[PDB]
Structure 1
Amino acid sequence: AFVRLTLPPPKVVDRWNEKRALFGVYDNIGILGNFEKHPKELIKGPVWLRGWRGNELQRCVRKKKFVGNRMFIEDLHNLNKRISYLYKHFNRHGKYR
């Protein structure tokens, strides 16, 4: 194997930038706020997995269910093929019956 002959530039991390300093604030919005909002409503991400979790087959089906009708042809064809592959893997293949 070959190794770097020089040290890379040192990594400088600001631990007190606004994002790091205020991380976690309002995670108790419900219990401390009379439950008007659930903490999951603060999660930013893809529309089909905000406040939700699942295995890859579940995620693929959930994305199709949410935004399947707004997807590009290449993407939708690839997503549909992924569902059929995962369907056959989880329901027919594995050590444990």
Structure 2
Amino acid sequence: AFVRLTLPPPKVVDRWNEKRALFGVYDNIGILGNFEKHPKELIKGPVWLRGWRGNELQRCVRKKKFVGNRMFIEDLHNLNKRISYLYKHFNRH
């Protein structure tokens, strides 16, 4: 193969920016907050996996139940077909 004849543009990274500098703050909310709020409550992301983790099949199944009423017909049918293939592999092989 042939490779670039020029260097990529230089990248400058600030390691003391607000995001990196303050990353993780309040991760001890439970111990330092009397455990009123569990650290799992601080997870931000898809609703079906906030405070929960599982394999892809479990994640997909949980996603379907959580937003199945809000899922598109095309998406719901496609998800069902994919789940069918996944179900046979995991539960029969």
User: Which bin holds the TM-score, normalised by the shorter protein?
Assistant: over 0.9
Q: CA deviation at 1:4?
A: 0.8
Q: Shift of the alpha carbon at 1:2?
A: 1.4
Deviations along 1:50-93, whole A, 9 cap, x unmatched? 11111111011000110111011121111111211110110122
User: For 2:86 and 2:11, how far apart are their aligned partners in 1?
Assistant: 40
Contact 1:30 1:39 in 2 (8 A): yes
Distance (Å, rounded) in 2 between the aligned partners of 1:81 and 1:26: 42
Show the counterpart of 2:63.
63
Partner in structure 2 of residue 19 of structure 1: 19
User: Deviations along 1:9-60, whole A, 9 cap, x unmatched?
Assistant: 0111111111111001111100111011000111100000011111111011
- Structure showing the higher helix proportion among its residues: 2
- Following the alignment from structure 2 to structure 1, what is the Cα–Cα distance between the partners of residues 17 and 75? 37
The 2-side partners of 1:87 and 1:70 are apart by 23
CA RMSD of aligned residues (A): 0.9
| 1:72 has 2:77 as partner | no
Query: 1:13 & 1:78 partners in 2: Cα distance?
Result: 41
8 Å contact 1:60–1:82 — kept in the other structure? Answer: no
Percent of pairs with identical residues: 100
TM-score, normalized by length of structure 1? 0.91
- How far apart, CA to CA, are the structure 1 residues paired with 2:61 and 2:77? 13
**Separation (CA, whole Å) in 1 of partners of 2:19 and 2:76:** 35
Most deviating of 70-79 and 36-45:
70-79
Structure 1 regions of 5+ residues with no counterpart?
Answer: none
Unaligned runs of 5+ in 2: none
